[PDB]
Amino acid sequence: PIPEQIKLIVDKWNPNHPNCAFKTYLYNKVDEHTVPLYGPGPNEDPKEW
């Protein structure tokens, strides 16, 4: 179980988002009717969104 923890730690400290462990969301204000836009991108879990 050694080369798993290592890979998981290498995964934690990373912007690739494999359970980044630095996952916090900040709410940016946007007036309507632009709400329909945004619209995440590459590695966004709809769950988190």
């Binding site: 007036d31 009717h33 632009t34 709400v35 329909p36 836009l37 945004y38 619209g39 995440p40 991108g41």
Partner: protein, 116 residues
């Protein structure tokens, strides 16, 4: 969007911008390709800080039939943000740019889905 206004921030003092405005406008014309069908116009110049100046421009394009109109702001911004063009702009002292058009949600969604 039809008003075609792009705001540019320059890392230059206002007096320097105004003092060489002819040259600045022609350099922007060159960045656009320099053809006689495009004309850069200055809408306004405003000091923002000791060595920061905002210059608002638009570009008039002429058609083969002699008709003229402003380049849409989104279209002009899209050109200026292209990596090669942005670099040329930075060489003129531009450190930022903004369009006034408030994009629709569908436009924003498209930009996020295809950031390049």
């Amino acid at each position: 969007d039809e008003d075609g206004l792009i705001s540019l921030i320059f890392n230059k003092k206002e007096s320097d911008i105004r003092g060489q405005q002819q040259q600045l406008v022609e350099s922007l014309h060159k960045v656009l390709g320099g053809h006689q069908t495009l004309t850069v116009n200055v809408e306004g110049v405003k000091t923002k800080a000791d060595n920061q100046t905002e210059v608002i421009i638009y570009v008039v394009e002429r058609s083969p039939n002699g008709t003229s109109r402003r380049v849409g702001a989104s279209a002009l911004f899209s050109y200026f943000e292209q990596a090669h063009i942005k670099a040329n702009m930075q060489s003129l002292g531009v450190t930022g740019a903004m369009a006034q058009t408030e994009l629709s949600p569908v436009q924003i969604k498209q930009l996020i889905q295809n950031p390049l």
